[PDB]
Design an enzyme around this catalytic site. Sequence first.
Site, PDB file in Angstrom:
ATOM      1  N   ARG A   1       0.798  -1.236   0.061  1.00 21.71           N
ATOM      2  CA  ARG A   1      -0.019  -0.034  -0.012  1.00 21.71           C
ATOM      3  C   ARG A   1       0.912   1.394   0.081  1.00 21.71           C
ATOM      4  NH1 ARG A   1      -5.186  -0.414   2.107  1.00 21.71           N
ATOM      5  NH2 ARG A   1      -5.500  -2.350   3.472  1.00 21.71           N
TER       6      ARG A   1
ATOM      7  N   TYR B   1       3.559  -4.103  -7.576  1.00 20.17           N
ATOM      8  CA  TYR B   1       2.790  -3.330  -6.434  1.00 20.17           C
ATOM      9  C   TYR B   1       2.800  -1.739  -6.894  1.00 20.17           C
ATOM     10  CZ  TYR B   1       2.882  -7.307  -3.085  1.00 20.17           C
ATOM     11  OH  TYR B   1       2.626  -8.301  -2.497  1.00 20.17           O
TER      12      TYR B   1
ATOM     13  N   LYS C   1      -3.938  -9.654 -18.878  1.00 18.43           N
ATOM     14  CA  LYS C   1      -3.414  -9.984 -17.707  1.00 18.43           C
ATOM     15  C   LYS C   1      -2.807 -11.512 -17.798  1.00 18.43           C
ATOM     16  CE  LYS C   1      -6.233  -7.036 -14.940  1.00 18.43           C
ATOM     17  NZ  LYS C   1      -6.577  -6.093 -16.123  1.00 18.43           N
TER      18      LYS C   1
ATOM     19  N   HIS D   1       5.605 -15.065  -7.868  1.00 16.88           N
ATOM     20  CA  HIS D   1       4.365 -14.529  -7.348  1.00 16.88           C
ATOM     21  C   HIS D   1       2.963 -15.486  -7.248  1.00 16.88           C
ATOM     22  CE1 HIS D   1       2.720 -10.028  -6.602  1.00 16.88           C
ATOM     23  NE2 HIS D   1       2.004 -11.100  -5.502  1.00 16.88           N
TER      24      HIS D   1
ATOM     25  N   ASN E   1       1.635 -18.511  -3.339  1.00 21.48           N
ATOM     26  CA  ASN E   1       0.183 -19.145  -3.672  1.00 21.48           C
ATOM     27  C   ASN E   1       0.487 -20.430  -4.227  1.00 21.48           C
ATOM     28  OD1 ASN E   1      -1.310 -16.616  -2.971  1.00 21.48           O
ATOM     29  ND2 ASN E   1       0.108 -15.671  -4.676  1.00 21.48           N
TER      30      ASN E   1
ATOM     31  N   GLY F   1      -7.941 -10.094   6.191  1.00 23.06           N
ATOM     32  CA  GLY F   1      -8.114  -9.143   4.834  1.00 23.06           C
ATOM     33  C   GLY F   1      -9.011  -8.223   5.206  1.00 23.06           C
TER      34      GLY F   1
ATOM     35  N   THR G   1      -0.074  -2.446   6.712  1.00 26.71           N
ATOM     36  CA  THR G   1      -0.705  -1.182   7.160  1.00 26.71           C
ATOM     37  C   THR G   1       0.246   0.047   6.631  1.00 26.71           C
ATOM     38  OG1 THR G   1      -1.680   0.050   9.085  1.00 26.71           O
ATOM     39  CG2 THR G   1       0.116  -1.539   9.481  1.00 26.71           C
TER      40      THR G   1
END
Lengths: 299, 299, 299
Positions: free
Chosen positions: A21, A54, A98, A129, A160, A215, A259
């Site tokens: 973020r 990101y 994508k 990723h 993942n 989440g 955060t």
Amino acid sequence: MQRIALSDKLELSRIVYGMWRIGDDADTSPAHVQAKIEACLAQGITTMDQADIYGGYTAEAILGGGLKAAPGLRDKIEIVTKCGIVAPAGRHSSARVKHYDTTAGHINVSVEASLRDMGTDHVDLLLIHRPDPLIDAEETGKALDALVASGKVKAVGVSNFRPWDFSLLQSAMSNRLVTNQIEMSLLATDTFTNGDLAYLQEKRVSPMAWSPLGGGSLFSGGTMAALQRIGKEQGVDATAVAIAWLLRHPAKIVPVLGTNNLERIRTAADALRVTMDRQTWFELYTLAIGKEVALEHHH
Amino acid sequence: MQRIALSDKLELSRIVYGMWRIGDDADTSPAHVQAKIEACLAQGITTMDQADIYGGYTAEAILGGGLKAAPGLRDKIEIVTKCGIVAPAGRHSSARVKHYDTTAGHINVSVEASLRDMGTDHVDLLLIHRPDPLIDAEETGKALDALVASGKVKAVGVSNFRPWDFSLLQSAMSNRLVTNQIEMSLLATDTFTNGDLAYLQEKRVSPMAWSPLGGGSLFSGGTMAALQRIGKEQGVDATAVAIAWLLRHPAKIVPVLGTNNLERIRTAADALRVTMDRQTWFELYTLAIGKEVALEHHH
Amino acid sequence: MQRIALSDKLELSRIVYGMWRIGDDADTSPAHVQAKIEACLAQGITTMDQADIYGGYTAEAILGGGLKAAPGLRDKIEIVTKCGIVAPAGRHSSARVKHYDTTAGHINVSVEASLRDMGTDHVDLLLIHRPDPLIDAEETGKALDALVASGKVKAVGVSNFRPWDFSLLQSAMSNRLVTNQIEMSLLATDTFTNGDLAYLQEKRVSPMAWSPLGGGSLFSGGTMAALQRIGKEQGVDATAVAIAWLLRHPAKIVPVLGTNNLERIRTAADALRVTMDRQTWFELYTLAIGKEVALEHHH
């Protein structure tokens, strides 16, 4: 903060700061990026989690603005980054769809951009990723092995991956994959019983837990009441208890907290203050799954 | 009755008598417990299946009342027991929640109680009763290995483990796990195609089948009509045919029959009288799954 | 046509001609069977795919009518056949129920009939046609090994096996299984993510793809529009693009095309003319699954 050795070559902080973020903050100045890293270091959180994608392929460069303006700051942290996802944004805007790209050429281009963007000659950990349904494991494993031999990447892992994806890529590599970054929390408990976590536990591989607070859905009844109760019994907030529930597992789960709030960074280490005994671990697990554990089959 | 070697160290009767209901009988006297064991021995059923948790942690002591009052009777039987499930009953009534415990300390305490309660210095087979999502495989495997080295336990296995649970615990042990006690019957056929039974068959591990009659639901149309027909063709009841359907499988399944009824014990061996050819095995499997086996994919 | 080595002992054409409908043609004369084989050979398709059960146990004999009347024609082709499925048709009409048979006796009887029916002393590849829930892997693996040692069968594989079925049978055999014939197409994409294809890719085993056009459902909106567009960009039809989507995968998938139409045989090789780049592969995969690939988990 307590350290965790993923291998003989890589040691993280037991909690990791997710920077996904960092580009969403109204303040992306070097000074505010440094402040966030310094708030982590004040709590012994030295590991930063990034990815090429990101901020639509800008979050690493925003972190780099911080690091390039603060000589010595990169030596205090470990950097995790990731590649393999190609979305039509930023430098990949020519992309028609994508997709995933696990080709040697793409991994090298993404790593070169991560080093350029963050102003460093090495990353501590590189993750594929997402599992690529079009992976050539021989090609990808050769690229990952050469990145370790080169010193540009200290260690490699995945994100993942299912056990069969992990197994396929590890079969094609000389270096051992040191982690799998997967969703784990009180709202995401499938890996505890479906073989995902058992596979990693048998291989003595620590997972990194993404969305370890569920989440945003956990804070928005019975589960939250118990987290708040235990927190109030131990002088910490419900957030620290939800992270300590992961820290309690003998697979040595490494939570990734994402955060932009300096006050949640200030308290992030409170999870290590929680004493989580076996019964408390089950109480929370049972409230989260919404049903008792299976008892005697003969009943 | 025909014997089955689970390993070089442990041999059972091909059918096992489940004692989970022994505490539910209105008669729990030593004399009635001895009568039940003697009815089994009359049919060559020498293997008794127990667990610490049965009768809310009293069924073993009720069996013990029988064994302690009949010198020589324990030498005639094998005893299977289990631990790992902690419910707030009997000696575990302090427990705040229903949980699993696979810790070395708990396994040892449960085994010591099984030996005390049944009046013996050894159990033939100890099973981890349920896969523990909080298992430390290194710790549990060390405790199980020491129990075998000590002579207190002749062999170890698991119960309700998935292949990945089995694989994780076996990776941490020197001794080979000799069984997995799982649900198998004409009403529970998933393990035949989902990898559970294939895994055991590749490892040359015999499963023990719990609820081999389908857990009371089979007797309460097409499946029952065929079991009754085959039984009437071979001079046995439908119950014997449902057990013989398990006995026919080349994985060498060991059914666990759990009746308090001396007349169903008297006839339990009738399953070994059934000739179950390949076509009959498929007829029953197909009636149970409710659809034909998949034929040629090109059609 | 480009060749594919399944092993050091067996090489196929990269596309395989499925003969499962040969008995459905109004014309089953030797002359029409020869014409179909000669149309394949004209496109470099040398591999014919058969099974004992095709045509209710008559399709091999119909192929044999062709081969027996055209000396030299069998030397130009590879023959794949299969056994293990027993339906009450033709020579198996005594059968009471549809079942599988993987017994040494049945495999040998089926192979002897395949050789008799096609007029040859060897088959290039023999597949167990379906995973048998009643398999004895030791017995089946011994029969398959002896068939290879004998020269009657050049190589062995399986069909419709899950990874655990493949693993169990391979554990019981000295010879390596060289393929798994499974459903793969733009309408059947589960194997790409569920571990089925990953397992084969780790073992360096090429799958054979059955119903590679989606079993007639693909031609009967967005997916078809993209296949037609790419075909029109590259001078081929939508059918060639749907096959090239399989040919693009690094697991080296071998499609099996099952048409009785001489004009679709004439064009079958057009799939090898398609350039399918990574993005195009993803465009088709995404249109077929009906949703975007999973992007960054942190979002």
